[PDB]
Structures are given as C-alpha cells and as structure tokens.
C-alpha cells in the first residue's frame, strides 16, 4: 500500500503464522522459531472493528413508503413516482459503491502502516547492534539466545549490554 511494507519491501506473507497478524521469525545459535507480536495484531484488528461497526447502523425507517410497482399505464403521476424512486436508487448504489471502495483502500493502508510501525519499533530498540537487510530482516551483530530473542519481542531488550559485542562484529 502507501507505506509499502506489505506487498512491498516485505517479499510476501507468512501463511503459517496462525496466532496473529504480525510477528517475528528468528535464526540464532539455538535454532529456528517464531512468535506473533500481539500489541500490533490488536491495534490493527481494533480499527477494523470500529470501522465495521461504524459502517453498519443505518436502516431507513420511513414513512408510509410510496407504491413502487404498477399494474396500469397512467402517464404522469406514475412517471414521476417511478423516476423519484428510480433516481433515489441510483444514488444509494453510488453512495454505497464509494463507501466500500473508500473504506478498503484505507483498511489496506492502515494494516500496511501497522507493519511498518512494528518495523521501526524494533529498529529503534536495537539502537546500534544491527542493520536492515531490506527484506524486512535485521542482521543482529552479536550472539543472541532464545532468552535474548524473546527479550527483544517483549520490549525489554537492553542495547547497552550487547553494545561493545555489537560494534566489533560490524566494523572490524
């Protein structure tokens, strides 16, 4: 979309992430695993919720509606009755087809933002100890265990502890 993470710099999507909408996949000294990031999978679902809910309540309740089908030819009063309704109809149909088209474009772009948002949340945590490869993947520049991967994902990473370890791997 606009932000160009999804269907963009992130090649494609994980058909085998089944506990969330956004997340991480590691390869470290201890092996290979994956986790959903919840906070973001919530805020993306929480707007769509509101949005849907907003689109819905709304139901035309009035008032002794005029006759709409006709069993004679009557010329003018009828000719108007039909054209009043015929016209109304075309309006709502447009009114509708715009809404869905609008909403979606946005639903699509907000879900895109949420990804790029989670990309930049990570980047800032790993202050100096990694570098963006551009396929939505970092290359951390130190040794990091399952306990350190899971420490990144739950907000509690400590750039300074693996700082010195990080810079030697990058530059020398």
């Amino acid at each position: 979309g606009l932000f160009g993470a999804i269907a963009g710099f992130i090649e494609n999507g994980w058909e085998g992430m089944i506990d969330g909408w956004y997340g991480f996949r590691h390869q470290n000294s201890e092996g290979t695993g994956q986790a959903a990031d919840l906070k973001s999978t919530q805020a993306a679902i929480d707007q769509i919720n509101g949005k849907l809910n907003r689109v819905i309540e709304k139901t035309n309740e009035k008032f002794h509606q005029i006759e709409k089908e006709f069993s004679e030819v009557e010329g003018r009063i009828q000719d108007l009755e039909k054209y009043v309704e015929d016209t109304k109809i075309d309006l709502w149909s447009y009114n509708a087809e715009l809404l869905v088209a609008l909403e979606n474009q946005h639903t699509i772009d907000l879900t895109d933002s949420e990804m790029n948002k989670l990309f930049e949340k990570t980047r800032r945590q790993l202050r100096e100890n990694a570098e963006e490869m551009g396929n939505g993947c970092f290359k951390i520049y130190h040794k990091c265990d399952n306990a350190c991967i899971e420490s990144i994902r739950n907000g509690t990473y400590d750039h300074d502890v693996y700082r010195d370890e990080a810079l030697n791997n990058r530059f020398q």
Partner: protein
C-alpha cells in the same frame, strides 16, 4: 359491460369529517347512503401485495 348479471354501476366517494365540522348529505335520487363512520387512527400502518405465506 355485464358483470354479475348487471350492467349498472355504483361509483364510490369519500369525505372526511373533522372534529367540530359537520356532514350534510343531500340528494333527490341515486344515493348510496353511508351508515356511519370509520375511525381514523394514523400511524405506521400500511399495505403490501405479496403472495408469500405468513409464518
């Protein structure tokens, strides 16, 4: 044209009487008198032309 034996017709009219107004019927032939009045509520009631069974 012939319909149920007859080729005569009746033509049906209405008249609303407001509260405080007065009806006065006057004729010298061919009247189909009313017998009284229907009450006139007014609210969300209406009619539809269906053929689907009520359930």
């Amino acid at each position: 044209p012939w319909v149920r034996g007859l080729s005569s017709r009746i033509s049906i009219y209405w008249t609303i009487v407001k509260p405080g107004d007065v009806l006065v019927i006057n004729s010298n032939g061919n009247l189909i008198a009313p017998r009284g009045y229907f009450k006139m509520r007014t609210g969300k009631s209406s009619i539809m032309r269906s053929d689907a069974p009520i359930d």
